[PDB]
Design a protein around this nucleic acid. Sequence first.
DNA 1: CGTAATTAATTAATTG
DNA 2: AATTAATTAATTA
Length: 897
Amino acid sequence: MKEFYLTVEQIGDSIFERYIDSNGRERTREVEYKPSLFAHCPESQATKYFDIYGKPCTRKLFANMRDASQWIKRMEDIGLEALGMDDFKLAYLSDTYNYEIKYDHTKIRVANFDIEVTSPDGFPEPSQAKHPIDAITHYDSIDDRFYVFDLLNSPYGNVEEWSIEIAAKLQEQGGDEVPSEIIDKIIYMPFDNEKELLMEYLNFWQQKTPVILTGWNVESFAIPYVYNRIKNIFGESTAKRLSPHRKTRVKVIENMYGSREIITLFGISVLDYIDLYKKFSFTNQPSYSLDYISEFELNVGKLKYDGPISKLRESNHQRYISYNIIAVYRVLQIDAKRQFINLSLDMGYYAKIQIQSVFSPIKTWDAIIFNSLKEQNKVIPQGRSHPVQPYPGAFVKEPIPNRYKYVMSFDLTSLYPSIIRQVNISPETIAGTFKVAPLHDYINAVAERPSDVYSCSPNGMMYYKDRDGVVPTEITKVFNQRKEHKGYMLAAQRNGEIIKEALHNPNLSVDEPLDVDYRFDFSDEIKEKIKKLSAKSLNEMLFRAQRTEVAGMTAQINRKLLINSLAGALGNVWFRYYDLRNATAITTFGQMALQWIERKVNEYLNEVCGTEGEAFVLYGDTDSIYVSADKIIDKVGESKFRDTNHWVDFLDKFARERMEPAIDRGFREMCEYMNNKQHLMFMDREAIAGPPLGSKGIGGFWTGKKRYALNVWDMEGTRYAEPKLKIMGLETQKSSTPKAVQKALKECIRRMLQEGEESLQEYFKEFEKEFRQLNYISIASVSSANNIAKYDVGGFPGPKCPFHIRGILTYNRAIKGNIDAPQVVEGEKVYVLPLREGNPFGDKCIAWPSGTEITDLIKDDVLHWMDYTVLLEKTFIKPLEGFTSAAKLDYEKKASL
DNA sequence: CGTAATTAATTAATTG
DNA sequence: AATTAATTAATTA
Ligand SMILES: Nc1ccn([C@H]2C[C@H](O)[C@@H](COP(=O)(O)OP(=O)(O)OP(=O)(O)O)O2)c(=O)n1
Ligand SMILES: [Ca+2]
Ligand SMILES: [Ca+2]
Ligand SMILES: [Ca+2]
Ligand SMILES: [Ca+2]
Ligand SMILES: [Ca+2]
């Protein structure tokens, strides 16, 4: 096997690299790297180096890395360009690994942990860390073992050792229910006093120093606390042992009075899972407590205990230690399903960057292009300073707010990455400019042809057609990877619906789940055996098919997110290849591509229907159009269709056979008209929406831009077993909206599109009657807590203070005195509830941290004054009024006249 | 230190 | 109430 690195850092003029050799063992080294930088030189001088624009460069090899740093400083005030990779560690990895890396994750020591700290004077701040650490659970990837460290004696209580026998027992039995699969993998370690626990953990840390370190909030709590408590006990230099190189940095955050810090251990790539999640999950959550996320991702129970958390050890020490392990493990379950760690490594290595650098797409693309160019002996241009500027983006069409019965959408395959490829947009493929006609003259094909030599964009930019640019070439590779993983995801999706269609009639047999590969569609062979399967074996097959989908999803969505970020990065000033001329060239083309095809599709469906100038494209957004199919089903008659599925198959066949060839005819012409490099505007059909055949439902509606819902039967190949709702932008998809309300409105949309006006009315009074009996947390609103510092004038709402902050400033006065109350963290998310006028809180609403039940001392007083009539009108009624008024419907039958 | 476009619910102020 | 403008938080792409 080939060699690969694990972690890379720079300390002085020396690079510290932990790696895996050709045999497959862990080795650490220290190299006096000699970095080379570049500068422009005389025309007539034979050398093998050129900058990206083609101009020659002379190589300056430096004796050490300070000499290379010094050199750039001098080059600046003198006024010359210092070309080459100035982030030197990357230039080390590009040399020491001149090939495409193939890592073996089993060799990479991934470790994730969590600690527990008992604090009876408030929330234990990691910066002070004046309280004892009374637990640590620390998993290892190569050991496959849970290393539990239990403190039995502390000046906050002395507790009997943790029973592994009780731990295994079920919750309902009196136990803690630690999943039996890991129970044999726990290696329990209790301790006499605090100091001797920490000493052992460090030896273990040395013997088994992590390469990837993770967990839940480990960066903002665990690591900060571990380091700081050791600083208070063993010293700073003994705490510096957490880095396998001894070097560590401390970053302190603001903050008027409150001090929070983030520690940087050199030689360990830290990826905090909470970060990973927000970045790669594509879910905006109400709460980011480990409990809530596990509930959401794994449908597992919630960690139930009595008393505040600061007193849990005292009473239920058994559950305290047990729950600690579960936490450490729950993350591992989230990753087995989500596979973000795998993604971090897939990306990190392909880019040749520190693994924690995957959070930065600019740092990612800078390494990808540098390595792309270096093999061609080209030299990267120096990073410049730019003023921040707004620039035009995507075109969004204004729809007529209305119901729409039959709808087919048509979407562009990875649009912005495609335009880069079609036009050949790169920093070095720029030719010049041209006279820009109104965008509309290009949309209507009436303006003069921009170029007969160059590839052009309606933002007035010409690009070379001869040899490929470095960006289009680099984005293609990653787009191809993205694609492969999507074709997987889509199968596991299609195969999910084959299991669900068959689950209609499950057999009362005793059979077992077939061993099949879910990334590829079931053959009409395996399909037939599924139709004979037990309900037991069908549901287990469905799980497997869905987990495959998730895993596939993660791969394809974040590879997408990555390449889209490159397009966006051209608009961020810190990106080495920042160029508004290029970013606008993309977006502007996008605007033309959509509005051009809006014309073309309308022009076709008039020529097919023999009609003259009627509208069919009703709404468009960035890269997709929505086509009304009313006239199509009208022309063949509603009477003629056997079942709902029959007209779906008919529109399916129509869109693929009659439309797409005219759509691809239209995009080929636009290519000619723009004299582009390559035609890459592929628009296939996406969703097929409509009511159930012979039902009262309305199909779909629009309430305006970026807000609508659809009854979708087919979603780009996946024929759904049960009709599925596509809701975009409505309060059902907004995290701020209460869970009970999200659920309720979704049933309203469901009945609107599927069952008719009459159905809506019946359910509306069904809900209004159940509302006042529902749990507060479910019916409470959510919002982020930004700028709470500003609107606070020593308590009480300031000038123009937002509704939620107003609510928080209520909380602070209520918990004035109570230490056993959770503090509202700036940036964190909170629940918001409106009180009635005349309450012990002296305000119109209150707010408290998300996830957590509101502290005992005020909880009673909140429910004692909650304004349900307002909460219902605000969250539920007003948005539904929005839906029905834009759909020509009534939710509550008129009591008047 | 990836992006823009767009919404709805706020509030402070003015509708003689 | 009902307009507008200004601000915040959240979407869709
Ligand atoms: N976070 C995002 C997502 C969207 N867009 C741009 C890039 C896309 O090209 C275009 C359309 O986005 P889509 O949601 O339709 O995703 P793609 O077209 O990129 O991929 P797919 O082929 O799956 O539709 O909008 C963007 O700039 N940044
Ligand atoms: Ca905990
Ligand atoms: Ca798309
Ligand atoms: Ca698509
Ligand atoms: Ca069956
Ligand atoms: Ca789309």
